[PDB]
């Protein structure tokens, strides 16, 4: 029970770095300021605002996969007496996110990195 | 008699904001940030030590004033 609360609190602490690196926010906030440098303006429209409009867009599309994380994990069918099925249970909980990263990452770079179904920890820089 | 100790500890807690306002530490700190800014150096000489060197001169001047308070009280 108390391992679930420290794991959720660790996700709330790490949440700015995951949205800063792991999700599709980097595709937004880079190309937004790319247009400003394409026009030649330096401080217009003052990129503090432009990071806002990149954040509401990236949160709007990341939220449906985030909603899947509730309905898999708020249920009461988590009691598995053997620890390996519970491990594969929470493996299958993050499976939509892992499937999303697999959909948007290049193939051979991932297997180069897990050379060291693929691990979520390995494809993250490859995304 | 007992609440004289309460007045002492309550004076003790509000001490460094008196050093922040009442003493001459405010003359040394400002001119030391200004000699950093006029040279164009931004981070160096690492103003955590510049607070210390500005504090030690102000204590060096303020010591005869504060010392008569102990012997009087």
């Amino acid at each position: 029970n108390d391992i679930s609360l420290i794991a959720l609190l660790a996700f709330s602490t790490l949440l700015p770095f995951i949205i800063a690196s792991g999700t599709c926010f980097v595709k937004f906030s880079i190309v937004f300021v790319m247009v400003r440098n394409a026009l030649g303006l330096q401080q217009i429209p003052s990129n503090m605002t432009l990071n806002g409009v990149a954040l509401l867009l990236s949160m709007f599309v990341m939220w449906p996969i985030m909603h899947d994380a509730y309905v898999y994990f708020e249920d009461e069918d988590v009691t598995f007496n053997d620890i390996s099925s519970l491990s594969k249970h929470v493996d299958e909980g993050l499976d939509g996110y892992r499937d999303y990263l697999i959909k948007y990452s290049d193939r051979e770079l991932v297997q180069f990195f897990e050379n060291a179904k693929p691990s979520i920890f390995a494809l993250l820089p490859a995304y | 008699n007992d609440i004289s100790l309460i007045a002492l500890l309550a004076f003790s807690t509000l001490l460094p904001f008196i050093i922040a306002s009442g003493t001459c530490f405010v003359k040394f700190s400002i001119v030391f940030v200004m000699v950093r800014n006029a040279l164009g150096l931004q981070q160096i000489p690492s103003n955590m030590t510049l607070n210390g060197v500005a504090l030690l001169l102000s204590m060096f001047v303020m010591w005869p004033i504060m010392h008569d308070a102990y012997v009087y009280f």
């Binding site: 709330s12 949440l15 949205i19 503090m48 806002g52 954040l55 | -």
Partner: protein
Amino acid sequence: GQAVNIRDRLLQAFSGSAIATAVDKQTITNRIEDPNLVTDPKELAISQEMISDYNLYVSMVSTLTRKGVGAVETLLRS
């Protein structure tokens, strides 16, 4: 004789937790204003639980709101 009756998601979330802390505040308030319920031990134990999960509830939504708004500033200053 005893009786019984039977019967944007953030905008429903804040309204849902709005009275969820109010009725648990009031049920231990009239638990403690009733003097018959504060003398019995097994009523005291379930009020002790009722205080303790009340503390964990509003502390959990406190810190989770704090880290929720804690994730926006660093990305916005960038």
